[PDB]
Amino acid sequence: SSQIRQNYSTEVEAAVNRLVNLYLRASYTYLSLGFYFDRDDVALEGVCHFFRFLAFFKAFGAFRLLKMQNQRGGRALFQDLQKPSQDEWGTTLDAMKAAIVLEKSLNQALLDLHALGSAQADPHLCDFLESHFLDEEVKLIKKMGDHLTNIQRLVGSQAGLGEYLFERLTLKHD
Amino acid sequence: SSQIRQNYSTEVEAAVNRLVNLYLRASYTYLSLGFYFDRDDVALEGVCHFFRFLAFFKAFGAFRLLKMQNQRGGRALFQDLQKPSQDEWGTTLDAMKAAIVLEKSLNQALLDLHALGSAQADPHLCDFLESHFLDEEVKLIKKMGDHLTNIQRLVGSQAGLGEYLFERLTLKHD
Amino acid sequence: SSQIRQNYSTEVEAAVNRLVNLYLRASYTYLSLGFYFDRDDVALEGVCHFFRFLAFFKAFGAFRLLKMQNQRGGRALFQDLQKPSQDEWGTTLDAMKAAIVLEKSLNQALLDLHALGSAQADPHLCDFLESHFLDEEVKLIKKMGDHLTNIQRLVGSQAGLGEYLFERLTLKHD
Amino acid sequence: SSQIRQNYSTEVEAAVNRLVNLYLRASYTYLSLGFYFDRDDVALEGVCHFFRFLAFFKAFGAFRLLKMQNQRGGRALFQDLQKPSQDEWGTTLDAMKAAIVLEKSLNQALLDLHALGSAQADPHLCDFLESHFLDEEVKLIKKMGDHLTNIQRLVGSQAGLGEYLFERLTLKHD
Amino acid sequence: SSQIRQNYSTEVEAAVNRLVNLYLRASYTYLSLGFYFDRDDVALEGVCHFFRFLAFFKAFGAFRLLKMQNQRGGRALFQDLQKPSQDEWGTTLDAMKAAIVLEKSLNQALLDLHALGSAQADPHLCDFLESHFLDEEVKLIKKMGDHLTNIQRLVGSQAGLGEYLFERLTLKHD
Amino acid sequence: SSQIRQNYSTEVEAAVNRLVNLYLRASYTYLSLGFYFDRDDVALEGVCHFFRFLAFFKAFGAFRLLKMQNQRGGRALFQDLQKPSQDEWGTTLDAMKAAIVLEKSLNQALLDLHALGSAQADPHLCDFLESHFLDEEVKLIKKMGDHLTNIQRLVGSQAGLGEYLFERLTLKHD
Ligand SMILES: [Cl-]
Ligand SMILES: [Cl-]
Ligand SMILES: [Cl-]
Ligand SMILES: [Cl-]
Ligand SMILES: [Cl-]
Ligand SMILES: [Cl-]
């Protein structure tokens, strides 16, 4: 079969392809979230920019996984990409909750693939995830949790005021 | 008649003169809105600056239309410029609603003139509007809609606080 | 009434609004003169540029008056802007004569408002006109008189030659 | 409904959403083509880079369409993204033929949407496609046709030699 | 037939080839006008330079049309280029009148090809002409009309003096 | 007749006009060759660029001849420009052979005009050709001969491979 493949199981190869799909689905979800916040009747630029950046970031993750698949002699296989779970995303709070849920699911998938790699004595795979994904993911979830907490603190009798202030004073815009 | 005029109908020539009037009326309306927000008892600099800029922008549009009238061999004809519809403009929300109404009317006038040009097989006219007015107008209306949405989100028990915060954190001032 | 208004009569406030109208009418007249000289069958760029600049200059004068109205606690009130006195402006000589007539009328209006301010013991108003309008106006009328004299000297059996040479050698173009 | 929507038909809105799907599907197809050419048993870097760039370019096209949908007051709706038509793409020639087929299909979709816009008297839509998509698409198809011709000229008894030389001397690598 | 041709009619292809011929004929006419004004017994450098530049400009137009023909998959076909209508071009006025006549004929040909493109639902063709030819042509005809008017104003008892002054003070030389 | 003409025969004047025609015909032939090699089904950029440059170079030669005609007091006379000998130009080899044939014909025409000048004791004419045309022409024919030899060496069982390699490694492209 492959002239380069070594210590690279069919199980890991398949799970890498599945993880690419999950990252591209996440990218697609973030594209939808970003354009929702760009609507004239939502109009929260800082939220749009936050999710738009994550769409690019998740696509980059898929690209890195696909590059690694080839470096190890595996074969990239693509599947249909499921549309995002929602067409409208509600409030900034609703969206940030959905994002944390998505990220925890991606994180569990990274942890599951790491555990498979460990079980299969594939240290290149384990290091790859540890070096390029696990800490990036922990840092992103921490940031979303921080944001969630600030959004929640700003919700009261005055939800619109809080939603505006969060977008203007925490999120990057211009 | 003209040594240069070619494929330039009397109907388009007249409609161009009418459109100049509409743009200058819009400029005048924006001058009034700007100075209203500069009043010591209104005092919203960011709103003043927003409308003052649009007054200049609409005058520029009229200048471009008049330059084109001459480039095509038509004759600029000016009519009286009607005073703005109001002497006092209410809240930022009231003003931004009035501006969107004005812009939609200008947009319909651009679309009507484009349709006349198309019907008269005048592609220079059509391209002129498409290249210098149609997208500029769509972009401006999108921005006003975004602003309207943010102003509306900030209205509640605390309308003054919201009006101040919008002017300070969304609109350009200094 | 106003939290800032002091020593600012209703008569001066009204006369300031009237003077804004006169300056905007003058701006409009200069816009018409400029585009007339831009016609393919007139084609005197230096004359077009001269009047176009005056259109901007007169609008600036109206802006300064409106800013002052607000600084004093008065209320800007806009009226319809009458179309210019002519649709076609004749020769450079005819146009420059019309401009001097317009400027003398604006000057008389400045002098009349100054006299009202003096009579009402409003030195801020008097100084405002003296510092930003009276000398600017005298300088502009002197320049137009100089131009008129040169245009007249160039009129003879060869009026077209003189009109061309004045536009090329006295007026700014490029 | 929308505070900004004007002259924007439901038919165009739906067709824009469909066109976004087509552009994202094209991006996905190009991602697959690129990683196929990055395989250790294919190893044609210049071809990988060509298709990888087109994946980014087609995603950019979808982003521009989605931005426009919002600028016009329409609502972005996403659908499932179908996996590419092939898992393996054959030779450079096979791939370049598949790309031209894909591009002609995207081009027909642009032309169809332009015709709908024209029929609906939507000049903003027509100009948008003309200014940002029609010529870009014609230029890309011309380049692929040029490439196809050069690949074909290099096919003979020595197909591998030709495939290597095309990748090294025509396509960008490093 | 062509691997790239799409939505490109035989009628448009033929009309593009005809238009190339017209632009090259115009270039040739301008070459002749330029060298006539370079004669020692004509000696009007500014007029020579004006027409020489237009010869280059019209050739550039033909080059752009030929590039587009290829981008669309059509086939460039060249025909004999007819010599200019005159061997001697008379006065600057005679020449500028001939140039405006030539330009109006080229403009009508552009408008005719645009109308054919519109009728054939070929928006790439329509946009190409609108973006690279229609406004350039309107601007050039406006300039020639301006020149004609100035030349005419300078004709009187003293035609030679006027012809010299126009060449020295309006046209670019050095 | 001419105030400047001296030692400039009617025979040389006529032959100069004929030579201008030949150079412009050559320019036209090179324009056709260049656009043929730009076809999507030919696609040899380096060959297109080679012939496109020669089209410009031959037009420059005609311009220099026309400038000289005027410097000597002769009168430029233009004739119809015959279309190129072919609509399709075959292979790079076929085209380069046609170009050498064209250049040898231009060279013979230069030599014939030089011999006429010598016979008529017109040393300005002789020097003009020697200084600006004879060596340029010898250098160009040497380059085409070098190219012909390299194209011929690359023709064998693998003509397409050779044609590609010549265009990529000898001719300038980018
Ligand atoms: Cl499937
Ligand atoms: Cl009236
Ligand atoms: Cl009224
Ligand atoms: Cl679904
Ligand atoms: Cl023939
Ligand atoms: Cl003939």
Numbering used by the authors:
A (entry chain A), B (entry chain A), C (entry chain A), D (entry chain A), E (entry chain A), F (entry chain A): 1 to 174
Article sentences:
As a scaffold for aromatic cluster design, we chose ferritin as a protein cage platform with a 12 nm outer diameter and an 8 nm inner cavity, composed of 24 subunits. To prove this concept through protein engineering, we focused on a two‐fold symmetric inter‐subunit interface of a recombinant horse spleen apo‐L ferritin (Fr) as a target region for mutagenesis. Herein, we present the construction of an aromatic cluster with an artificial molecular binding pocket at the two‐fold symmetric interface of ferritin and explore its ligand‐binding characteristics. We developed a system that uses ligand binding as a driving force to induce and propagate changes in the orientation of multiple aromatic side chains.
To modulate the shape of the central pocket, we prepared Fr‐F5/59A (Fr‐E53F/E56F/E57F/R59A/E60F/E63F) and Fr‐F5/59L (Fr‐E53F/E56F/E57F/R59L/E60F/E63F) in which residue 59 was replaced with Ala or Leu (lower). In the case of Fr‐F5/59A, the replacement of Phe59 with alanine (Ala) results in an expanded pocket size. Conversely, in Fr‐F5/59L, the introduction of leucine (Leu) imposes steric hindrance, effectively obstructing the pocket's entrance. These variances in pocket morphology among the variants are anticipated to impact ligand binding affinity and specificity. Replacing Phe59 with Ala or Leu significantly reduced the incorporation amount of NR (1.4 molecules for Fr‐F5/59A and 0.4 molecules for Fr‐F5/59L). Although there was sufficient space for NR in the A59 pocket (distance between A59–A59' 7.9 Å), the substitution of F59 with A59 excluded π–π stacking interactions at the site. As a result, NR has poor affinity to bind at this site in Fr‐F5/59A.
